[PDB]
Design a protein around this ligand. Structure first.
Ligand code: POV
Ligand code: POV
Ligand code: POV
Ligand code: POV
Ligand code: POV
Ligand code: POV
Ligand code: POV
Ligand code: POV
Ligand code: POV
Ligand code: POV
Ligand code: POV
Ligand code: POV
Lengths: 243, 243
């Protein structure tokens, strides 16, 4: 008759009596736990069992024997399959990896387009509300200020107020530079008057031509500035911004 | 015009001035300067007190030549000082502090009295008016929270339910690990039956009592048994007579 699923027609109406098997054991064992309990006593002992149990414990070792030599041999033909099918699954999963794109783009869209949806109002609902907290900073800092400025001074010494000249004992030294400082200040004193005596004579030579030896060095340096120099001196500048 | 002179060091970008200036006129200025120097007094006095500056840079490095080399000796003693000082500076200090402690009282009462005088009413508006800011937050823990919650599923997974069954191209593993346990668990399940049929029989050798105690419990296990052949097929021979 009929294959696994499609031809289910009358395979099976006489199915539901195969549960009536299991079911109606419990319709009847209810009447039949009554009469075993009625006779319960014995003459047993704790000796006769240990013949049975000693043999029955032997009857683990014997058929463990060959079964132990079985599910070893059996699982290399899984692992030898596995270590060759290793190369097949690495191309099998690739043939699923790239086709999925529509799904992981829809998940990207359900994460990225629905990330900005929350932040786009929240940026403004923080900025427009934080003006009441800009006033919590702007009208806090300067009214601290007015006591904080005296709390920088109030607050620093008596200015070590002396009632007599002899209320420090102190001394001044520093010969470490002060001696070399006097020599660098006394070589300097002779330098700034040697480099004045030749200059004072070079100065006071020229109390007339001084305005016009200067002009003789302007005269032809002028006339070209309005002619040859004009395109050069129309730029003046450039500049900042790398070339 | 534009900004006349140079913001920064600049060998490189000033080429846009240096080319065009030299091309038209930054040539001839040097030869009109040559004729400004060779005309009047004067061509001797650009030299006569130039090498007095050359020999001042020489006389600096050759005076600060034997006062280079021969000089960080006359001064060490001042800081052979300082290491003794900043280890013996004791005797000011444990006499200094004691009397000024008396005005340090009437300055904690400048610094801290005038602080809480502001710092209570500095926050007496916005400790109460924090409950304005909580309507800009507690009513916003829905778009910050209640659907950032639902994003725990939108990450993993925004359920892969299809709008029609015709969707996934799917097929079984099927081979290796599953057949390997179905055969060497299979035949071991059959010997678990044999070791049950053996080991559970060994115990009835030392059963008893009472002679009525056995023949009550037959019928529920024997009637479930009797209907079990209902299977039909409708073939009646099964081909596995393990059926
Ligand atoms: C090799 C191994 C083989 C294993 C299978 C061997 C099985 C051997 C036997 C087995 C049969 C069961 C014997 C139970 C005896 C209990 C005493 C009793 O009064 O029984 C009775 C009442 O019992 C009830 O009132 C309780 C319900 C029945 C017992 C169910 C629990 C059993 C486990 C307990 C857990 C204890 C836990 C604490 C342990 C420290 C049952 O008998 P009765 O029909 O009433 O007749 C008595 C006389 N009368 C009618 C005048 C009253
Ligand atoms: C890589 C190697 C580099 C080496 C570097 C080495 C560096 C070494 C460093 C050396 C500096 C040492 C300190 C000197 C301090 C002098 C103070 C002093 O004597 O004061 C005197 C007055 O004042 C003068 O007589 C002094 C005037 C100083 C002129 C300025 C020199 C500037 C040089 C610029 C160079 C710029 C740097 C150049 C580079 C850009 C005394 O004061 P008084 O007692 O009250 O006077 C009363 C009158 N009475 C004196 C007549 C009685
Ligand atoms: C304004 C900005 C200026 C910047 C440029 C400045 C550049 C300046 C300099 C630049 C370089 C100069 C090099 C000179 C070397 C001389 C070495 C030598 O042998 O000397 C001697 C010590 O020698 C010792 O062993 C001491 C070495 C420690 C020197 C550290 C000094 C730092 C002072 C920092 C202070 C300022 C801190 C800053 C202010 C807070 C030994 O000499 P000698 O063989 O015994 O000689 C013959 C015998 N005789 C001595 C009796 C005659
Ligand atoms: C530059 C960096 C680049 C990185 C790229 C990363 C890529 C990441 C991608 C990874 C791919 C993940 C699977 C996505 C779905 C595959 C396609 C599909 O839907 O297949 C099928 C259903 O789905 C299945 O058959 C999949 C079965 C998954 C089993 C559980 C795997 C556990 C992995 C746990 C450990 C994983 C560790 C991962 C670590 C990252 C449906 O069939 P189809 O094939 O669609 O064919 C349809 C017919 N057609 C072909 C004609 C149209
Ligand atoms: C301190 C307590 C120690 C307990 C240790 C227990 C350890 C042991 C575990 C025991 C578990 C028992 C499992 C039995 C399962 C049925 C097996 C079956 O299919 O056939 C059997 C049914 O016969 C029996 O099972 C006999 C039961 C006798 C009970 C005797 C009373 C003992 C009281 C004890 C009170 C204990 C209370 C405590 C319980 C925790 C065999 O059939 P057959 O009769 O051989 O058939 C004859 C023909 N043939 C030979 C051709 C086949
Ligand atoms: C927790 C740990 C696990 C324990 C698991 C332990 C359980 C393991 C499970 C075991 C269940 C299976 C047992 C074997 C059944 C064999 C089939 C059969 O009996 O055929 C025989 C029927 O002939 C007989 O009646 C002869 C005597 C055997 C009867 C066995 C009935 C068991 C009733 C048990 C009641 C217990 C109530 C308990 C209530 C709670 C032989 O066929 P035949 O020779 O053609 O028949 C001649 C007669 N004719 C001419 C009429 C046909
Ligand atoms: C980097 C920073 C990440 C931040 C993530 C922040 C996540 C958000 C944080 C917190 C959740 C949002 C705030 C909830 C406030 C309570 C609201 C309410 O009362 O309860 C709510 C439930 O609440 C839950 O369902 C809690 C959800 C926790 C999800 C954590 C996901 C972590 C994802 C990342 C993991 C990465 C792991 C990476 C691998 C290591 C609602 O109650 P209900 O009973 O459910 O609703 C019934 C219907 N009713 C509403 C009509 C009544
Ligand atoms: C995108 C899905 C991701 C699922 C991932 C789930 C996670 C597990 C990963 C992977 C197993 C995924 C199997 C289900 C595939 C989807 C359903 C399907 O096609 O089932 C079918 C194919 O059945 C199979 O393809 C069976 C695959 C081999 C056995 C299960 C291996 C479990 C690995 C566990 C590894 C971890 C254990 C680690 C322990 C340390 C069968 O069912 P059906 O379709 O109802 O059949 C109707 C008939 N039809 C097929 C003709 C229509
Ligand atoms: C107290 C609590 C309840 C305990 C209930 C214990 C019940 C114990 C019950 C019975 C004891 C064992 C009986 C074994 C019978 C073997 C013979 C057999 O029928 O073989 C056949 C079927 O083979 C199959 O059906 C294979 C079984 C598949 C695995 C099912 C596991 C269920 C685990 C459930 C785990 C649940 C627990 C989960 C716990 C987390 C194959 O052989 P054949 O091909 O038909 O042979 C004829 C043809 N030939 C000649 C060509 C060969
Ligand atoms: C809350 C749950 C626990 C309830 C506890 C209830 C405890 C009650 C338990 C046990 C009480 C058993 C009382 C009857 C003992 C009679 C002994 C008799 O002589 O037998 C004879 C067999 O013939 C028989 O009829 C064997 C009967 C024992 C079967 C018991 C287990 C089967 C059910 C298992 C159901 C699954 C259990 C699943 C458990 C999860 C002995 O063999 P023989 O061939 O005659 O020997 C040769 C002739 N000669 C003797 C003259 C030399
Ligand atoms: C997947 C769902 C599984 C559900 C569970 C399935 C359970 C499986 C159900 C049943 C298992 C049955 C196995 C017994 C095999 C016996 C073989 C024997 O030779 O036949 C015997 C049959 O009679 C007895 O064995 C039955 C005795 C009935 C009383 C039982 C009391 C309760 C035992 C409860 C035990 C609790 C212990 C618990 C310990 C852990 C003896 O036959 P006989 O009488 O010589 O025949 C000749 C007749 N004449 C003398 C009249 C001429
Ligand atoms: C912003 C930061 C600023 C920090 C401050 C600057 C850094 C300052 C810190 C250190 C620089 C100097 C290091 C000196 C190393 C000495 C080596 C040695 O073993 O000497 C030892 C002593 O010497 C001491 O124990 C060290 C004391 C040095 C003090 C500083 C002098 C700087 C002078 C700058 C002067 C500029 C002058 C003006 C020039 C125009 C042992 O020597 P001796 O045996 O006792 O005597 C040798 C000679 N005799 C044999 C002839 C007696």
């Amino acid at each position: 008759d009929e294959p696994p699923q499609s031809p289910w027609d009358r395979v099976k109406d006489l199915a539901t009596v195969y549960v009536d098997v299991l079911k109606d054991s419990g319709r009847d064992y209810v009447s039949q736990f009554e009469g075993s309990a009625l006779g319960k006593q014995l003459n047993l002992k704790l000796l006769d069992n240990w013949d049975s149990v000693t043999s029955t414990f032997s009857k683990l070792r014997e058929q463990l024997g060959p079964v132990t030599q079985e599910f070893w041999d059996n699982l290399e033909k899984e692992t030898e399959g596995l270590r060759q099918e290793m190369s097949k699954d690495l191309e099998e999963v690739k043939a699923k990896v790239q086709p999925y794109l529509d799904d992981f783009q829809k998940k990207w869209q359900e994460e990225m387009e629905l990330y900005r949806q929350k932040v786009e109002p929240l940026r403004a609902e923080l900025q427009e509300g934080a003006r009441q907290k800009l006033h919590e900073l702007q009208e806090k800092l300067s009214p601290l200020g007015e006591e904080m400025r005296d709390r920088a001074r109030a607050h620093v010494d008596a200015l070590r107020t002396h009632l007599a000249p002899y209320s420090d004992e102190l001394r001044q030294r520093l010969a470490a530079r002060l001696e070399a400082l006097k020599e660098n200040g006394g070589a300097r004193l002779a330098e700034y008057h040697a480099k004045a005596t030749e200059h004072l004579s070079t100065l006071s030579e020229k109390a007339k031509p001084a305005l016009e030896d200067l002009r003789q060095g302007l005269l032809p340096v002028l006339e070209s500035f309005k002619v040859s120099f004009l395109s050069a001196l129309e730029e003046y500048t450039k500049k900042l911004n790398t070339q």
